[PDB]
Amino acid sequence: DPDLNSASQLAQGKVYWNIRFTDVPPAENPNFRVEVTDQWLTEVLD
């Protein structure tokens, strides 16, 4: 920790570390978005 490890805190024995992380969230709702389009309809020409 850059701010919490002050010279007054270090001189009392306190020394601080930060551990930031992200867990793996369980995919409780896998959503799917299906659509019928006409984008590749001109692909039937060759």
Next chain:
Amino acid sequence: DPDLNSASQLAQGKVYWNIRFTDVPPAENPNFRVEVTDQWLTEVLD
């Protein structure tokens, strides 16, 4: 047809083909163009 087969024409079930041909016309007037020349008049020399 590259133009008439669009993505919006094919989405309605329309698909276009072009059949361009040439009929064999009847020779109703064979024209003949007969002429006398002097190009082969110099052939009788050898």
